[PDB]
Write the structure tokens for this entry.
Amino acid sequence: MVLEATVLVIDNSEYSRNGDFPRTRFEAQIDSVEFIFQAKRNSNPENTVGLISGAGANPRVLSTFTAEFGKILAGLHDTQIEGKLHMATALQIAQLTLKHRQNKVQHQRIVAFVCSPISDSRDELIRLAKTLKKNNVAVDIINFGEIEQNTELLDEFIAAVNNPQEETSHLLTVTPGPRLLYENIASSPIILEEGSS
Amino acid sequence: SATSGEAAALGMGLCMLGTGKPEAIHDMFTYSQETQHGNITRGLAVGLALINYGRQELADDLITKMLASDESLLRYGGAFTIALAYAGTGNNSAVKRLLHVAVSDSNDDVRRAAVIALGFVLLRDYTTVPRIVQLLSKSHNAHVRCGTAFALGIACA
Amino acid sequence: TKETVYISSIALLKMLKHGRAGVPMEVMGLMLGEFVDDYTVNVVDVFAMPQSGTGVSVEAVDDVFQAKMMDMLKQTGRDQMVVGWYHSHPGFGCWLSSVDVNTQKSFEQLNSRAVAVVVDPIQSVKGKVVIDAFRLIDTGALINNLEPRQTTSNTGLLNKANIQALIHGLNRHYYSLNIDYHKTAKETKMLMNLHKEQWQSGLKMYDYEEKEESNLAATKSMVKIAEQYSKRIEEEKELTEEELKTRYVGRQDPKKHLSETADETLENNIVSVLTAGVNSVAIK
Amino acid sequence: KRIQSVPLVIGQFLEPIDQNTGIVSSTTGMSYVVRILSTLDRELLKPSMSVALHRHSNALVDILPPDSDSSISVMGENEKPDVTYA
Amino acid sequence: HEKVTIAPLVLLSALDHYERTQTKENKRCVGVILGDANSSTIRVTNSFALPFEEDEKNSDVWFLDHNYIENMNEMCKKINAKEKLIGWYHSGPKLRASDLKINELFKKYTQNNPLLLIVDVKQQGVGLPTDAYVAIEQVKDDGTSTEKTFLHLPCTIEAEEAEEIGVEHLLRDVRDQAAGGLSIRLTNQLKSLKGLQSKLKDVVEYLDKVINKELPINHTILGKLQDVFNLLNNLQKALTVKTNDELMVIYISNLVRSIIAFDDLIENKIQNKKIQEQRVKD
Amino acid sequence: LIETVFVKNIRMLSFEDISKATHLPKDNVEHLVMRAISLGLLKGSIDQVNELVTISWVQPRIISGDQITKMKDRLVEWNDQVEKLGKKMEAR
Amino acid sequence: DKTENDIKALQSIGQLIGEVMKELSEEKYIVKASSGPRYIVGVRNSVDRSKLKKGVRVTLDITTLTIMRILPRETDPLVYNMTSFEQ
């Protein structure tokens, strides 16, 4: 829509370190995330993607706001091989991250990659969901592999944030299978509403 | 605006001529920490001396609060407020409080403030005017020698 | 027509670390703050420019260096509006630099509130900041004749010779200002308690008494050996029957042979009082 | 004393005149009478030791310590000689 | 020996940011130090500010920019290229435990030994509240595990030619540097004992923390508080026989030579007597 | 015995309670403690003719909490004596 | 292109000759300029005291009177100092 600052949260747990996708998982994820960084870079001149690791025995930080994927590579080649995803603590870091933006003209859309199920209750995320509408920021949820072996705990997180598509509350779902990893974006609405290809 | 800001501070102090009221005193003291202008900040301290006329020792509470601050512009009425009816024969306790403050601090606003009450106490005898303040011209400095003849133009005029 | 310059304590010393004791090849930088023209001047946020081989150049004036600095203003929370630029020159008697004024001219039309404050890294050794200012005409009588420095009496600007007497004719290119310093409550007693004289010396209980084993006898030797000489020399010099006063050696000859011996007795009496007695604070 | 500071000009002592007033010979051969600083130690003066002056004002700066030794005359000591006396 | 020397501009630069964003009341402001030290001695002069935010309820909430904040160091590299990152400084009014977990992220960008300072928003103590930390692996006798902890070292305030007279020119009010400074320091030494006595009142609360509900007991603290008796008080009475004699010798040599040097002012009456003889022309 | 010997001013034991508790001759007990002395327990030096055990006690002796009632209070009340006597030094 | 660097070089005047004689203060030492009378100049932090010892050529400014950098010791290989014809 307009100038936005993407907040990227990936999952470093054991499910991202395996070959579950029948080509490559973590090897092609470096390119797929880079292609998303390059897609938003051509749409808007101001591109800053924070890289926050919300897994691996409490949330970590790999990269920071930058205009080039070179600094992101420092966090792509270094991945913690243990721990699981903690949604409660990592989101509170993302809430404070929303206030570190440079100018008010730069919007924010939180993008989260969830490779592993979480034990966090949904009621804890409801009160934390009101911070999205308070700062007028967007949210993007990309989850694959959890929906098969577990229910969706972030569905009610979108309910309290539910708003028309001109502001926030964009829910996405990715189901793996006999496909291409970069092709997973095609099923997501994020690839649509674009006049460049 | 620093143009009419200090001029408005003088009119506010002229509103109360007499014993005064503590309500108008606390208001002018609170606004001193808000505005960034020097003439307005000092203008609020100048008006405090005009609000209290004849209060004298009962005004030492406001005088203590002004002299306790580190700001130079907040010390003004620590002299003029004390000496009003003390013309002619005065009190040595009022002068003693202005000695150690002026001699210890070389600041301009702190030293020039106490000079105001010096000319009021010396109205008793013109011959004794170049006596107490006689030490002001014996040293070498601008403001130390500047406060010398101020008392000579009042009682000795 | 007339102004007055006020500079806070935080904005007072930054570059002077590089300017004063950080040797020549001085740098420059930007000043920030908020004030009202013709009355007061305020400087708060300051950050310097990069150093090059030629010193001040176009690359330092270029905003590419400032582009990443302006982004750090909102992040660190410290942000203001441009109040001017600052420079340094190694004490030129006349016409420090005409390049820094050209930078002031190009940035004057976009601000008109900018003040150029330069300081001498050489002659500031005395501890006092050298006061100099370059500014465009404020509300102009300066195109012909006007007197800057509100309260035109004030105090003699000193300096040296040339630009002191060039104020009248060159007033268009040179606008004089009196620079004053100020500090708030958090800048007054807060820093004084941690500085005073020398250092703050945290944990005052640390002293040299815990180091005293053989030096206790060494202190007893210093209050005797060197003192016995001061006793004989004092009588040796006074024994002279010449006198005659007038001039002779009397500038200071006798100090070391007479009066300093009394001070030399005191020098060993000061270190005796230094620890004095019972410096273990009562107990046993 | 800090008004002098770095521009040291090496002088030479000549003869005292008055308290804090004296003539100081210069290495250029031009004697100058300058006011002696009251901080300076006046019992260390000799018609040998060099002193410090100024470039423009040519005023006496500081009385130099015993470290005033100048190596222009090659001032040094002997380190581990060779020829033996015995 | 490792001695941290801190410039006072570090405290003044952070004090401005405390007023701007109103950062106080258990809110840490992270920063980074600067200097060139290849030895154990650490020299801290210039310092930057890191836009850090934390939660009061959750101490595990931390966000710190890696290469985005280093742009200030890149801008300073062209200014001074001799100084690099030797460490970092935080606030930590209640001393959050977040710094104990990860010592690698801060050491990755700082090639020097890990150093952690403390700049409080208050810093109003008469003592030395500024404290330094060195994160290493130290053996603990508590019986749990040997892990990375903080090593305390004394620090001070730096004074160089630039800021030495600059602060004195700003104050120029109360100095009083003379032989009478003993009364100021020895009283402060008594205040230092009273300042530690206030810390002993926190030790009184330490027992109340054991009285509190489900709190452990530190065995390392008990080791230092166990020797307070046998060390340094009627035990020293046996050594007071020869000890008091050493304090008397100081009084012997002092009082005999103190009344000598003060007798050289007799010339005052001699000069005043000559004034009356000079009154022929007066 | 180390906990027993330490009350206020007594740092010193004798050969009485040490030999009677261990049921060993005093000749060996002198050299048997020295094997435990090298472990860092006590740095003292035992005498012979005086029949008195000098004790330099470096041992940490953990598991506290019986002493801390009186131990911690003696670091305050006895330290308050210094604070009371130091109030007359406030003249300068 | 080589002349343009000299246009911007008007701010830095060509420095005179100097050699360290005897250590006096911490940094600043006693240096007699062979280009004239005895002038003790300042020092700069761009260099350290390892090469500032006695018997080495230094670089001293005419106006500011400091030590800029440390140049190697020059024996002035003139025609009579070192003959251009060798062997």
The beta strands of chain C are 5-7, 29-33, 46-48, 81-88, 116-119, 133-134, 179-181. The CA atoms of residues 91 and 162 of chain C lie 13 Å apart. Chain C touches chain E through 80 residues (CB under 8 Å).
